[PDB]
Amino acid sequence: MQRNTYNKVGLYILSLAMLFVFIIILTAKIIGLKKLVLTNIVPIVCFVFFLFSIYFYNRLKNITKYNGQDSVKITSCQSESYESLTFLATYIVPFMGFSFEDMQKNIAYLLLVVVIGIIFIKTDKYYANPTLALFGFKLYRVNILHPGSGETKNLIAISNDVLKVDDNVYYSFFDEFVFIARKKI
Amino acid sequence: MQRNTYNKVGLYILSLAMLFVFIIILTAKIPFCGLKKLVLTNIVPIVCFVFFLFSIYFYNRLKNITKYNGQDSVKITSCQSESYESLTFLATYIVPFMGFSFEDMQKNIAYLLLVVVIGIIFIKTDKYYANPTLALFGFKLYRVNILHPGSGETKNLIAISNDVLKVDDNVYYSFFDEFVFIARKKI
Amino acid sequence: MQRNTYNKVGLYILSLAMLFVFIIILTAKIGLKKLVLTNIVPIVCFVFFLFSIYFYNRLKNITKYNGQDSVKITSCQSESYESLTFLATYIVPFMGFSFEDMQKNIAYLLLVVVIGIIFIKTDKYYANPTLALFGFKLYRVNILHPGSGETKNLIAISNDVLKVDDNVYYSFFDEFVFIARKKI
Amino acid sequence: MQRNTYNKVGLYILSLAMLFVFIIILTAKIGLKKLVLTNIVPIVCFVFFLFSIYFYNRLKNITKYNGQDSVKITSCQSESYESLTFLATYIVPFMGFSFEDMQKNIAYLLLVVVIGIIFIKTDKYYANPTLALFGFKLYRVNILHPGSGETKNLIAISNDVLKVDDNVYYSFFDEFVFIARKKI
């Protein structure tokens, strides 16, 4: 339960990484180093989320590095390629002027991004935010066959590589709704 | 007739409950320390606080709707996972420049007329069940064909429930309006 | 062509009429010629609202026309999409940005006219559920005109619910759509 | 490969052609180089306004390339979507954004590019209605080349109107999506 949820939010934090770079180039109050961290209190507290996202980006590729225990079977392929652009129109646009010169206001903006965190995970739509396509992630439904268990029903999968039809390659499961794939050497 | 519109707009207030919590946390005024001037600055926070208590009351009302069992027939078959959940309705309701902006009072009631016009024009188009804030409270949305104990089979109507429900399970229900309805699980 | 485009763009005018009656309250800043001179955009959007009143009564007078018009409909089916990207690009801008300078207000009126010509050319006028606030419902219906023949499921607009296979009244917009009434 | 992408980005950069027309109006500041130094955001987008004209004559050269190409299309069908999620995100919200300060004005120009890097890779550059403002009506076509086989529901771009099942002319963006026009 816990380990299915900590990796779950990691794509969403990776999905907000393209948002996070704007705040540095939107908040530029630029020697009294105590005053600079006082005046520019907002970029120095959001830069760690850039460090969080890169850490999850290295984490996401490290799941694919585990190759000593993975199973290898895929039946068929289908590239649906939705990547719904409406999510960009929900989460990145409404922070026009993210730092409107009052920290009490800026609590609510940071309150907004975490409340939609529970919203946009529990609705199970995190894999269609088009910021994930910036990192070359291709989306597709494939009904695989497991080597041990039976046939799956056209499950949504996200991966960085283009798959041909019925290619028995490596992968790694995320849950029984989505997973992460690989290629066979 | 009046109760259908009443619990329709009550579900709309439950959808806007997070907007309400955001706007108490947004436009509350700092004392940092004669109270009547602070109350005069507290007018938008207190009216949306009354709105938030209305949301609490209608959430308790929905729990009461789950609680009446004496007049409840069961008679449920099948299940189909529709799961539409269009987030554009979130992007229009809960972020009107994030609710309100703190400059002018007549502009504030202009946004008040904006949100009540939005309320009437999305209750008149029979698609109130749209926001992904109902799923924040734990609800899930999917469309199931139902037979009646007295009447026959429905025609692919929308259902709403909190607890998890599956195919051909004979479970409880409520009656929101003549079209959509709330379900539970049979104990 | 001129009358067809005129009563085509009038639906979009009535769509934006709700935005105009918001912006009356939005930009109202209250020997009165100074008050006239400062609040010129309430006056011109009030004029636009009067144009909306004129077109609402114009299509109402169109709906009274049933004698000289042909009145033949068969069948019915309902689609009823009326999505909200239209209102997301219509109302949400005018509450999104700031509205002070008249020089930039000229550019916002140029927004209005170019988004009108976009929504005219691409055939997305029959949209923005502000129309459905005025009793309107959307569904495509294959109608029969026995002088001409059977049509193929063209999208239709009416202010009343119409069921299947009823020889109700209509009035004709242009080569694809029409407004509809109910027979007596 | 190399020549495909530079023509692929031209559809997006001409879809923002009218966006440049209001930036010179929204930030209209009206020896004399100090006047130029104030209004850098009109005069920079006036250059891509000239680039929008430049690609508009360039795409006509693509249609008017030569005569040995552009052989035949067998079938035709229509989709005509012009989905409006791309509007209110691409043309509109920059006016929803405000231009008053220098450091944001560079920062919103990075918001232009990071849209387009996504928008190219999502393969959605046949959907802006601003491209349809220039007279283009957009519709998928199954084609059969004489020397090649039958392709499966590829996307066609055409200014002038075409009917169904006619052997007509074309031109290429790349192998997948293509320009269509009419046979003399």
Coordinates of N, CA, C and O in Angstrom, one line a residue, chain A residues 12-153:
Chain A
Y12 N 3.9 12.5 -11.0 CA 3.2 13.8 -10.9 C 4.2 14.9 -10.6 O 4.1 16.0 -11.1
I13 N 5.1 14.6 -9.6 CA 6.2 15.5 -9.3 C 7.1 15.7 -10.5 O 7.6 16.9 -10.8
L14 N 7.4 14.7 -11.2 CA 8.1 14.8 -12.5 C 7.3 15.6 -13.5 O 7.8 16.3 -14.3
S15 N 5.9 15.5 -13.5 CA 5.1 16.2 -14.4 C 5.0 17.7 -14.1 O 4.8 18.5 -15.0
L16 N 5.3 18.1 -12.9 CA 5.3 19.5 -12.5 C 6.7 20.1 -12.7 O 6.8 21.3 -12.3
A17 N 7.7 19.4 -13.2 CA 9.0 19.9 -13.2 C 9.1 21.0 -14.3 O 9.9 21.9 -14.1
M18 N 8.3 20.9 -15.3 CA 8.3 22.0 -16.3 C 7.7 23.2 -15.8 O 8.0 24.3 -16.2
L19 N 6.7 23.1 -14.9 CA 6.2 24.3 -14.2 C 7.2 25.0 -13.3 O 7.2 26.2 -13.3
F20 N 8.0 24.2 -12.6 CA 8.8 24.7 -11.5 C 9.9 25.6 -12.0 O 10.4 26.5 -11.2
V21 N 10.4 25.5 -13.3 CA 11.5 26.3 -13.8 C 11.0 27.8 -14.0 O 11.8 28.7 -14.0
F22 N 9.7 28.0 -14.2 CA 9.1 29.3 -14.4 C 9.2 30.2 -13.2 O 9.4 31.4 -13.4
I23 N 9.1 29.7 -12.0 CA 9.1 30.5 -10.8 C 10.4 31.2 -10.6 O 10.4 32.4 -10.2
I24 N 11.5 30.6 -10.9 CA 12.8 31.2 -10.9 C 12.9 32.4 -11.8 O 13.3 33.5 -11.5
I25 N 12.4 32.2 -13.1 CA 12.4 33.3 -14.1 C 11.2 34.1 -14.0 O 11.0 35.0 -14.8
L26 N 10.3 33.9 -13.1 CA 9.2 34.8 -12.8 C 9.5 35.6 -11.5 O 9.0 36.8 -11.4
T27 N 10.3 35.1 -10.6 CA 10.6 35.8 -9.3 C 12.1 36.1 -9.3 O 12.9 35.2 -9.0
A28 N 12.5 37.3 -9.7 CA 13.9 37.7 -9.8 C 14.0 39.1 -9.1 O 14.0 40.1 -9.7
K29 N 14.2 39.0 -7.8 CA 14.5 40.2 -7.0 C 16.1 40.3 -6.9 O 16.7 40.0 -5.9
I30 N 16.6 40.8 -8.0 CA 18.1 40.9 -8.1 C 18.4 42.0 -9.2 O 17.5 42.4 -10.0
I31 N 27.1 42.6 0.1 CA 25.8 42.1 -0.3 C 25.1 41.5 0.9 O 25.6 40.7 1.6
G32 N 23.8 42.0 1.1 CA 23.1 41.6 2.2 C 22.4 40.2 2.0 O 21.2 40.1 1.7
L33 N 23.2 39.1 2.2 CA 22.7 37.8 1.9 C 21.6 37.3 2.7 O 20.8 36.5 2.3
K34 N 21.4 37.9 3.9 CA 20.3 37.7 4.8 C 19.0 38.3 4.1 O 17.9 37.8 4.2
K35 N 19.2 39.4 3.5 CA 18.1 40.1 2.8 C 17.7 39.5 1.5 O 16.5 39.5 1.1
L36 N 18.7 38.9 0.8 CA 18.4 38.3 -0.5 C 17.6 37.0 -0.3 O 16.6 36.7 -1.0
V37 N 17.9 36.2 0.7 CA 17.1 35.0 1.0 C 15.8 35.4 1.7 O 14.8 34.6 1.7
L38 N 15.7 36.7 2.2 CA 14.4 37.1 2.7 C 13.5 37.6 1.6 O 12.3 37.3 1.6
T39 N 14.1 38.5 0.7 CA 13.3 39.0 -0.4 C 13.0 37.9 -1.4 O 11.8 37.7 -1.8
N40 N 14.0 37.1 -1.8 CA 13.8 35.9 -2.7 C 13.6 34.7 -1.8 O 14.4 33.8 -1.8
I41 N 12.6 34.7 -1.0 CA 12.2 33.5 -0.2 C 11.5 32.4 -1.1 O 11.6 31.2 -0.8
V42 N 10.8 32.9 -2.1 CA 10.1 31.9 -3.0 C 10.9 31.1 -4.0 O 10.6 30.0 -4.2
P43 N 12.0 31.6 -4.6 CA 12.7 30.7 -5.5 C 13.5 29.6 -4.7 O 13.7 28.5 -5.2
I44 N 14.0 30.0 -3.6 CA 14.9 29.1 -2.8 C 14.1 28.0 -2.1 O 14.7 27.0 -1.6
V45 N 12.8 28.1 -2.0 CA 12.0 27.0 -1.5 C 11.3 26.2 -2.5 O 10.9 25.1 -2.2
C46 N 11.3 26.6 -3.8 CA 10.8 25.8 -4.9 C 11.9 25.1 -5.7 O 11.6 24.3 -6.5
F47 N 13.2 25.5 -5.5 CA 14.3 24.9 -6.2 C 14.5 23.5 -5.7 O 15.0 22.7 -6.4
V48 N 14.1 23.2 -4.5 CA 14.3 21.8 -3.9 C 13.3 20.9 -4.6 O 13.6 19.7 -4.8
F49 N 12.2 21.4 -5.1 CA 11.3 20.5 -5.9 C 11.9 20.2 -7.2 O 11.6 19.1 -7.8
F50 N 12.7 21.1 -7.8 CA 13.5 20.8 -9.0 C 14.5 19.7 -8.7 O 14.7 18.8 -9.5
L51 N 15.0 19.7 -7.5 CA 15.9 18.7 -7.0 C 15.2 17.4 -6.7 O 15.7 16.3 -6.9
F52 N 13.9 17.5 -6.2 CA 13.1 16.3 -6.0 C 12.8 15.6 -7.4 O 12.8 14.4 -7.5
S53 N 12.4 16.4 -8.4 CA 12.0 15.9 -9.7 C 13.1 15.2 -10.4 O 12.9 14.1 -11.0
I54 N 14.3 15.7 -10.4 CA 15.5 15.1 -11.0 C 15.8 13.8 -10.3 O 16.2 12.8 -10.9
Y55 N 15.7 13.8 -8.9 CA 15.8 12.6 -8.2 C 14.8 11.5 -8.5 O 15.2 10.3 -8.6
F56 N 13.6 11.9 -8.8 CA 12.6 11.0 -9.3 C 12.9 10.6 -10.7 O 12.5 9.5 -11.1
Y57 N 13.4 11.5 -11.5 CA 13.8 11.2 -12.9 C 14.9 10.2 -12.9 O 14.9 9.2 -13.7
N58 N 15.9 10.3 -12.0 CA 16.9 9.3 -11.9 C 16.3 8.0 -11.3 O 16.8 6.9 -11.6
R59 N 15.3 8.1 -10.4 CA 14.7 6.9 -9.9 C 13.9 6.2 -10.9 O 13.9 5.0 -10.9
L60 N 13.2 6.9 -11.8 CA 12.4 6.3 -12.8 C 13.2 5.5 -13.8 O 12.8 4.4 -14.3
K61 N 14.4 6.0 -14.2 CA 15.3 5.2 -15.0 C 16.0 4.1 -14.3 O 16.4 3.1 -14.9
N62 N 16.1 4.2 -13.0 CA 16.7 3.1 -12.2 C 15.8 1.9 -12.0 O 16.3 0.8 -11.7
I63 N 14.5 2.1 -12.1 CA 13.6 1.0 -12.1 C 13.8 0.1 -13.4 O 13.8 -1.1 -13.3
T64 N 14.1 0.8 -14.5 CA 14.5 0.1 -15.7 C 15.9 -0.5 -15.6 O 16.3 -1.4 -16.4
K65 N 16.7 -0.1 -14.7 CA 18.1 -0.7 -14.6 C 18.0 -2.1 -13.9 O 18.9 -2.9 -14.2
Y66 N 17.0 -2.4 -13.2 CA 16.8 -3.7 -12.6 C 16.5 -4.7 -13.6 O 15.3 -4.7 -14.1
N67 N 17.5 -5.5 -14.0 CA 17.3 -6.5 -15.1 C 17.6 -7.9 -14.7 O 17.5 -8.8 -15.6
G68 N 17.9 -8.1 -13.5 CA 18.3 -9.5 -13.0 C 17.1 -10.4 -12.6 O 17.3 -11.5 -12.3
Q69 N 15.9 -9.8 -12.6 CA 14.8 -10.5 -12.1 C 13.5 -10.3 -12.8 O 12.4 -10.8 -12.4
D70 N 13.5 -9.6 -13.9 CA 12.3 -9.2 -14.7 C 11.8 -10.3 -15.6 O 12.6 -11.1 -16.1
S71 N 10.5 -10.3 -15.9 CA 9.9 -11.2 -16.8 C 9.7 -10.5 -18.2 O 9.8 -9.3 -18.3
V72 N 9.5 -11.3 -19.2 CA 9.9 -10.9 -20.5 C 8.8 -11.0 -21.6 O 9.1 -10.9 -22.8
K73 N 7.5 -11.2 -21.2 CA 6.5 -11.6 -22.2 C 5.6 -10.4 -22.5 O 5.0 -9.9 -21.6
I74 N 5.4 -10.1 -23.8 CA 4.4 -9.2 -24.3 C 3.7 -9.8 -25.5 O 4.4 -10.2 -26.4
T75 N 2.3 -9.8 -25.5 CA 1.6 -10.1 -26.7 C 1.0 -8.8 -27.3 O 0.4 -8.0 -26.5
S76 N 1.1 -8.6 -28.6 CA 0.4 -7.6 -29.4 C 0.9 -6.2 -29.0 O 1.7 -6.0 -28.1
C77 N 0.3 -5.2 -29.8 CA 0.6 -3.8 -29.5 C -0.5 -2.9 -30.1 O -1.2 -3.3 -31.0
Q78 N -0.7 -1.7 -29.5 CA -1.6 -0.7 -30.0 C -1.2 0.6 -29.5 O -1.2 0.9 -28.3
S79 N -0.9 1.5 -30.4 CA -0.5 2.9 -30.0 C -1.7 3.8 -30.1 O -2.1 4.2 -31.2
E80 N -2.3 4.1 -28.9 CA -3.5 4.9 -28.9 C -3.1 6.4 -28.9 O -3.8 7.2 -29.7
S81 N -2.1 6.8 -28.2 CA -1.5 8.2 -28.3 C -2.5 9.3 -28.0 O -2.6 10.2 -28.8
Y82 N -3.2 9.2 -26.9 CA -4.0 10.3 -26.5 C -3.2 11.5 -26.0 O -3.1 12.5 -26.8
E83 N -2.6 11.4 -24.9 CA -1.8 12.4 -24.2 C -2.6 13.7 -24.1 O -2.3 14.7 -24.7
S84 N -3.7 13.7 -23.3 CA -4.7 14.7 -23.2 C -4.2 16.0 -22.8 O -3.7 16.2 -21.7
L85 N -4.3 17.0 -23.7 CA -3.8 18.4 -23.5 C -4.5 19.2 -22.5 O -4.1 20.3 -22.2
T86 N -5.7 18.7 -22.1 CA -6.5 19.5 -21.1 C -5.9 19.7 -19.8 O -6.2 20.6 -19.0
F87 N -4.9 18.8 -19.4 CA -4.3 18.8 -18.1 C -3.3 20.0 -18.0 O -3.1 20.6 -16.9
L88 N -2.7 20.4 -19.1 CA -1.9 21.6 -19.2 C -2.8 22.8 -19.0 O -2.4 23.8 -18.4
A89 N -4.1 22.8 -19.4 CA -5.0 23.9 -19.2 C -5.6 23.8 -17.8 O -6.5 24.7 -17.5
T90 N -5.2 22.9 -16.9 CA -5.7 22.9 -15.5 C -4.7 23.3 -14.5 O -5.1 23.9 -13.5
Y91 N -3.4 22.9 -14.7 CA -2.5 22.9 -13.5 C -1.4 23.9 -13.7 O -0.8 24.3 -12.7
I92 N -1.0 24.3 -14.9 CA 0.1 25.1 -15.2 C -0.3 26.5 -15.6 O 0.3 27.5 -15.2
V93 N -1.4 26.6 -16.4 CA -1.9 28.0 -16.7 C -2.4 28.7 -15.5 O -2.1 29.9 -15.4
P94 N -3.1 28.2 -14.4 CA -3.8 29.1 -13.4 C -2.8 29.7 -12.5 O -3.2 30.5 -11.7
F95 N -1.5 29.3 -12.5 CA -0.5 30.0 -11.8 C 0.1 31.1 -12.8 O 1.3 31.1 -13.1
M96 N -0.8 32.0 -13.2 CA -0.3 33.3 -13.8 C 0.0 34.2 -12.7 O -0.8 34.5 -11.8
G97 N 1.3 34.7 -12.6 CA 1.8 35.4 -11.5 C 1.7 34.6 -10.2 O 0.9 34.9 -9.4
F98 N 2.5 33.6 -10.1 CA 2.5 32.6 -9.0 C 2.8 33.3 -7.7 O 2.4 32.8 -6.6
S99 N 3.5 34.4 -7.7 CA 4.1 35.0 -6.5 C 3.6 36.4 -6.3 O 4.4 37.4 -6.2
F100 N 2.3 36.7 -6.2 CA 1.7 38.0 -6.2 C 2.0 38.8 -4.9 O 1.1 39.2 -4.2
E101 N 3.3 39.0 -4.6 CA 3.8 39.9 -3.6 C 3.2 39.8 -2.2 O 3.2 40.8 -1.5
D102 N 2.8 38.7 -1.8 CA 2.3 38.5 -0.4 C 2.4 37.0 -0.1 O 1.8 36.1 -0.8
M103 N 3.1 36.7 1.0 CA 3.3 35.3 1.4 C 2.1 34.6 1.9 O 2.0 33.4 1.9
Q104 N 1.1 35.4 2.5 CA -0.1 34.8 2.9 C -0.9 34.3 1.7 O -1.5 33.2 1.8
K105 N -0.9 35.0 0.6 CA -1.5 34.5 -0.6 C -0.8 33.3 -1.1 O -1.4 32.3 -1.6
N106 N 0.6 33.3 -1.0 CA 1.4 32.3 -1.6 C 1.3 31.0 -0.8 O 1.7 29.9 -1.3
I107 N 0.7 31.0 0.4 CA 0.3 29.8 1.1 C -0.8 29.1 0.3 O -0.7 27.8 0.1
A108 N -1.8 29.8 -0.2 CA -2.9 29.2 -0.9 C -2.5 28.7 -2.2 O -3.1 27.7 -2.7
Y109 N -1.6 29.3 -2.9 CA -1.1 28.8 -4.2 C -0.4 27.5 -4.0 O -0.6 26.5 -4.7
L110 N 0.5 27.4 -2.9 CA 1.1 26.1 -2.5 C 0.1 25.2 -1.9 O 0.3 23.9 -2.0
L111 N -1.0 25.7 -1.4 CA -2.1 24.8 -0.9 C -2.8 24.2 -2.1 O -3.3 23.1 -2.1
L112 N -2.9 25.0 -3.2 CA -3.6 24.5 -4.4 C -2.9 23.3 -5.0 O -3.6 22.3 -5.4
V113 N -1.6 23.4 -5.1 CA -0.9 22.3 -5.9 C -0.9 21.0 -5.1 O -0.7 19.9 -5.7
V114 N -1.1 21.0 -3.8 CA -1.1 19.7 -3.1 C -2.5 19.2 -3.0 O -2.7 17.9 -3.0
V115 N -3.5 20.0 -2.9 CA -4.9 19.5 -2.9 C -5.3 18.8 -4.3 O -5.8 17.8 -4.3
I116 N -4.8 19.4 -5.4 CA -5.0 18.8 -6.7 C -4.1 17.6 -6.8 O -4.3 16.8 -7.7
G117 N -3.1 17.4 -5.9 CA -2.3 16.2 -5.8 C -3.2 15.0 -5.5 O -3.1 13.9 -6.2
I118 N -4.0 15.1 -4.5 CA -4.9 14.0 -4.1 C -6.0 13.8 -5.2 O -6.4 12.7 -5.5
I119 N -6.4 14.9 -5.8 CA -7.4 14.9 -6.8 C -6.9 14.1 -8.1 O -7.6 13.2 -8.5
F120 N -5.7 14.5 -8.5 CA -5.3 14.0 -9.9 C -4.6 12.7 -9.8 O -4.4 12.0 -10.9
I121 N -4.3 12.1 -8.6 CA -3.9 10.7 -8.5 C -5.1 9.8 -8.3 O -5.2 8.8 -9.0
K122 N -6.1 10.2 -7.4 CA -7.2 9.3 -7.2 C -8.2 9.2 -8.4 O -9.0 8.3 -8.4
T123 N -8.1 10.2 -9.3 CA -8.9 10.0 -10.5 C -8.2 9.2 -11.5 O -8.9 8.8 -12.5
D124 N -7.0 8.8 -11.3 CA -6.2 7.9 -12.1 C -6.1 8.4 -13.6 O -6.5 7.8 -14.5
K125 N -5.5 9.7 -13.7 CA -5.3 10.3 -15.0 C -3.9 10.9 -15.1 O -3.7 11.7 -16.0
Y126 N -3.0 10.4 -14.3 CA -1.6 11.1 -14.2 C -0.8 10.8 -15.5 O 0.2 11.6 -15.7
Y127 N -1.1 9.8 -16.3 CA -0.2 9.4 -17.4 C -0.6 10.2 -18.7 O 0.0 9.9 -19.7
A128 N -1.5 11.1 -18.6 CA -1.9 11.8 -19.8 C -1.6 13.3 -19.8 O -2.0 14.1 -20.7
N129 N -0.9 13.7 -18.7 CA -0.5 15.1 -18.7 C 0.7 15.3 -19.7 O 1.7 14.7 -19.6
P130 N 0.5 16.2 -20.6 CA 1.5 16.3 -21.7 C 2.9 16.8 -21.4 O 3.8 16.8 -22.2
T131 N 3.1 17.2 -20.1 CA 4.5 17.4 -19.7 C 5.3 16.2 -19.6 O 6.6 16.3 -19.8
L132 N 4.7 15.0 -19.5 CA 5.5 13.8 -19.5 C 6.0 13.4 -20.9 O 7.0 12.7 -21.0
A133 N 5.3 14.0 -21.9 CA 5.8 13.8 -23.3 C 7.1 14.6 -23.6 O 7.7 14.4 -24.7
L134 N 7.4 15.6 -22.8 CA 8.7 16.3 -22.9 C 9.9 15.4 -22.8 O 10.9 15.6 -23.5
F135 N 9.8 14.4 -22.0 CA 10.8 13.4 -21.7 C 10.7 12.2 -22.6 O 11.2 11.1 -22.2
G136 N 10.0 12.3 -23.7 CA 10.0 11.2 -24.7 C 9.2 10.0 -24.3 O 9.5 8.9 -24.8
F137 N 8.2 10.2 -23.5 CA 7.4 9.1 -22.9 C 6.2 8.8 -23.9 O 5.3 9.7 -24.0
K138 N 6.1 7.6 -24.4 CA 5.1 7.3 -25.4 C 4.1 6.4 -24.7 O 4.4 5.5 -23.9
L139 N 2.8 6.7 -25.0 CA 1.7 6.1 -24.3 C 0.8 5.2 -25.3 O 0.7 5.6 -26.5
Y140 N 0.3 4.1 -24.8 CA -0.2 3.0 -25.6 C -0.9 2.0 -24.7 O -0.5 1.8 -23.5
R141 N -1.9 1.3 -25.2 CA -2.5 0.1 -24.6 C -2.0 -1.2 -25.2 O -2.0 -1.3 -26.4
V142 N -1.6 -2.1 -24.3 CA -1.2 -3.4 -24.8 C -1.8 -4.5 -23.8 O -1.7 -4.3 -22.6
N143 N -2.4 -5.5 -24.4 CA -2.9 -6.6 -23.7 C -1.8 -7.7 -23.7 O -1.7 -8.5 -24.6
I144 N -0.9 -7.7 -22.6 CA 0.1 -8.7 -22.6 C -0.4 -10.0 -22.1 O -1.5 -10.1 -21.6
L145 N 0.5 -11.1 -22.2 CA 0.2 -12.3 -21.6 C 1.3 -12.6 -20.5 O 2.5 -12.3 -20.8
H146 N 0.9 -13.0 -19.3 CA 2.0 -13.2 -18.4 C 2.5 -14.6 -18.5 O 1.8 -15.5 -18.9
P147 N 3.8 -14.8 -18.2 CA 4.4 -16.2 -18.2 C 3.7 -17.1 -17.2 O 3.6 -18.3 -17.5
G148 N 3.3 -16.6 -16.0 CA 2.7 -17.4 -15.0 C 1.2 -17.3 -15.1 O 0.5 -18.3 -15.1
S149 N 0.6 -16.1 -15.0 CA -0.8 -15.9 -15.0 C -1.4 -15.7 -16.4 O -0.7 -15.9 -17.4
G150 N -2.6 -15.3 -16.5 CA -3.4 -15.3 -17.8 C -3.2 -14.0 -18.6 O -2.3 -13.2 -18.4
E151 N -4.2 -13.8 -19.4 CA -4.2 -12.7 -20.4 C -4.7 -11.4 -19.7 O -5.7 -11.4 -19.0
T152 N -4.1 -10.3 -20.0 CA -4.5 -8.9 -19.6 C -5.4 -8.3 -20.6 O -5.6 -8.8 -21.7
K153 N -6.1 -7.2 -20.1 CA -7.1 -6.5 -20.9 C -6.6 -5.1 -21.2 O -7.0 -4.2 -20.5

